[PDB]
Amino acid sequence: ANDNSEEMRHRFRQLDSKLNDLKSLLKEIANNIK
Amino acid sequence: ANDNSEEMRHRFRQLDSKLNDLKSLLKEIANNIK
C-alpha cells in the first residue's frame, strides 16, 4: 500500500515553512526600518 | 510507462529554487541595511 500524495504533501509543508520563514524575515525587517 | 508525478515534481524543485534565491536575496539585503 503506497501513495504519492504524502510526499508532494510534505513538499508543500516544507515550501510553506520556507514561506513562513520569509514572512517572519519581512515583518522583522519591516519593523527594523521604521 | 509514463507518469506526471515527475514533471510537477520538477516544477516544485524550480519554484523551491526560486524561493531559495529569494531567501538568499532577503538575508543579503537584511544584512546590507544594518
Asked if B15 contacts A14 with a C-beta cutoff of 8 angstroms, the reply is: no
- Determine the distance in angstroms separating the CA of A1 from the nearest CA of chain B, rounded to an integer: 18
DSSP state of B4: S
Task: List CB contacts of A18: < 8 A, sequence separation 6 or more.
Answer: B16, B19, B20, B23
Task: List CB contacts of B5: < 8 A, sequence separation 6 or more.
Answer: A4, A8
Give the determination technique: cryo-EM
Cell of A15: 515550501
- Closest to B31 in 3D by CA, of A32, A15, A24, A19: A32
Count the Cβ atoms, other than its own, within 10 Å of residue A12. Answer: 11
Helix crossing, A5-33 with B5-33: angle to 10°? 20
- Closest to A17 in 3D by CA, of B29, B31, B23: B23
- Determine the distance in angstroms separating the CA of A34 from the nearest CA of chain B, rounded to an integer: 12
Resolution (A): 2.9
- CB-CB neighbors (< 8 A) of B16 in chain A: 11, 14-15, 18
